[PDB]
């Protein structure tokens, strides 16, 4: 299947977010309420975005660290389809969020970061987690960290374990061929779409490139 | 003496105010819980600091990435302190700290779930002076108790030079487990907010801390 495209709305206010969505809502598959938007506006951002775009998958990038059932329920009651749980959360946090996700016919992704282990990845699978987000951190990127070999190896191994893998972190169009040949579920682009001279054409470029590389 | 912090793990400001109108003057630190950060957003920090400008306000944002951006949003809303989750990239913690210094604030690393001693030394090397030793709410709900391994870890963190906050379903009766350790802050959320008498609950915590330290 072609990798899907997710836009990250890492905006501090809803109106800033809408400057993007009014252009590209129908140019992407998934609309993410970025952590920065969740923190800027609260869970109303999920409710309002889903109300505008009820046919789209809406992902709340809550990066849940604890209180899995409470935070997940807040997001799902606001009509989220998918929610994120940070990988260092206690395993009961992920399990809790998943339990609530199932109630709402939604799903949970584990957001990968820090010194996570392959034993922990197996724990997520045994818990029934089917999605992981492989993130090059914005702050690592800013400190000069590049996408490379070790990332491809890890992503392939996560996929082989049965996860649908999302890839993100300052992706540019030129980065996509690094991942060719791997059944990536979703690529997220935030800055590379929102900050482009033409967000519509940036999103279209990503779609064209994906269609060529995975066609 | 260890300070007393109340956690406002509420979904709306009006629910938080049900607690702060009783106990704001009975604690040292008012926490905007992660639940409140997600429920209302950074307006919660702004509003609570305006109400209680003489109290330390902690935004329990549990920052996982975009350290400079998220911490600036909290500090522009007049936070004193902000949390960064322990598995954040080291550059996220450094970024949040750099911004905190612009505002004469501080960053705490939230030790909830998995982390390593090597990471602890990294935080120290980066200039981080505060950690929050948590028993995860979800771990507690799964029957995990406070135990000697926690005490040993807290002492170790203190010995590395961190000011240590202790939290996670703390009851009054738990305080003596930590006796002898120079704890910076004890946090209570449920044990204060959900008490038949929140005022009595907060004062009992302060009374006990004063006895033990
Ligand atoms: O493409 P970016 O601007 O890096 O945004 C996507 C990224 O996944 C962010 O939403 C994020 O969650 N960073 O932690
Ligand atoms: O005393 P509690 O109800 O456990 O609340 C304090 C705790 O520190 C929470 O604010 C929290 O951050 N749990 O992850
Ligand atoms: Mg995101
Ligand atoms: Mg908290």
Chain B residues 90-129 with CB within 8 Å of chain A: 91-92, 94-95, 110, 112-116, 118-119
Contacts of residue A55, Cβ cutoff 8 Å, sequence gap at least 6: none
Task: Tally C-beta pairs within 8 A across A and B.
Answer: 152
The structural domain count of chain B equals 1
For A66, the token pair is: 């604890």
3-state class of B17 per DSSP?
helix
Technique used by the depositors: X-ray
Q: Which of A90, A116, A119, A143 to mutate to test the interface with B (most CBs of B within 10 A)?
A: A90
Distance, CA of B6 to CA of B187 (rounded, Å): 6
CA distance A65 to A45: 20
**Residue B94 DSSP code:** H
What torsion do the CA atoms of A147, A153, A159, A161 make, to the nearest 10 degrees?
-140
Provide the CA A214 distance to its chain's centre, in angstroms: 20
Judged by its nearest atom, the ligand closest to the C-alpha of residue A70 is 2
Burial of A174: CB neighbours in 10 Å, binned 0-12, 13-18, 19+ = exposed
Q: Give kind and range of the element (H or E) at residue B107.
A: strand B106-111
- β-strand partners of B27: none
Residue A182, helix vs strand vs coil: coil
User: Distance between alpha carbon B206 and the CA centroid of its chain, in Å?
Assistant: 17
Contacts of A32 (CB under 8 A, 6+ apart): A6, A7, A8, A9, A58, A59, A60, A61, A188, A190
CATH number at residue B138: 3.20.20.70
Domain span at residue A125 reads: 1-215
| Distance (Å) of CA A10 to CA A17, A36, A122, A190, A194 | 8, 5, 30, 7, 9
For B41, the closest of A40, A90, A113 (CB atoms) is A40
Task: Out of B64, B65, B87, give the residue to mutate to test ligand 1, the one with the largest number of ligand atoms within 8 Å of its CB.
Answer: B65
Question: Could you please report the per-residue DSSP string of B157-202?
Answer: HHHTTPEEEEESS--GGGGGGGTTS--SEEEESHHHHTSS-HHHHH
The answer to whether B80 is a known ligand-binding residue is no
Tell me how far apart the alpha carbons of residues B46 and B113 are, in angstroms, rounded to a whole number. 29
Nearest CA in chain A to B38: A42
Give the experimental resolution in Å.
Answer: 1.7
> Looking up tokens 């609309």, which residue turns up?
A31
Backbone dihedral region of A47: left (phi > 0), alpha (psi from -120 to 50 degrees) or beta?
A: alpha
Q: How many residues does chain A have?
A: 215
């Amino acid at each position: 299947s072609l990798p899907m495209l997710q836009v990250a709305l890492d905006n501090q206010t809803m109106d800033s977010a809408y400057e993007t969505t009014r252009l590209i809502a129908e140019e992407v598959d998934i609309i993410e309420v970025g952590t920065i938007l969740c923190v800027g506006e609260g869970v109303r951002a999920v409710r309002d975005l889903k109300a505008l775009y009820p046919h789209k998958i809406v992902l709340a990038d809550a990066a849940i660290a604890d209180a899995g059932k409470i935070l997940s329920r807040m997001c799902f009651e606001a009509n989220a389809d998918w929610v994120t749980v940070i990988c260092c959360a206690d395993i009961n946090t992920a399990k809790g969020a998943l339990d609530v996700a199932k109630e709402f016919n939604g799903d949970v992704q584990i957001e990968l970061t820090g010194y996570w282990t392959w034993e922990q990845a197996q724990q997520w699978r045994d818990a029934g987690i089917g999605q992981v987000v492989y993130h090059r951190s914005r702050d690592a990127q800013a400190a000069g960290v590049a996408w490379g070999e070790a990332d491809i190896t890890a992503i392939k191994r996560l996929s082989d374990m049965g996860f649908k893998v999302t890839v993100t972190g300052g992706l540019a169009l030129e980065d996509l061929p690094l991942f060719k040949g791997i059944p990536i579920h979703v690529f997220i682009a935030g800055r590379s779409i929102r900050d482009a001279a033409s967000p519509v054409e940036a999103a279209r470029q990503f779609k064209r490139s994906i269609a060529e590389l995975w066609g």
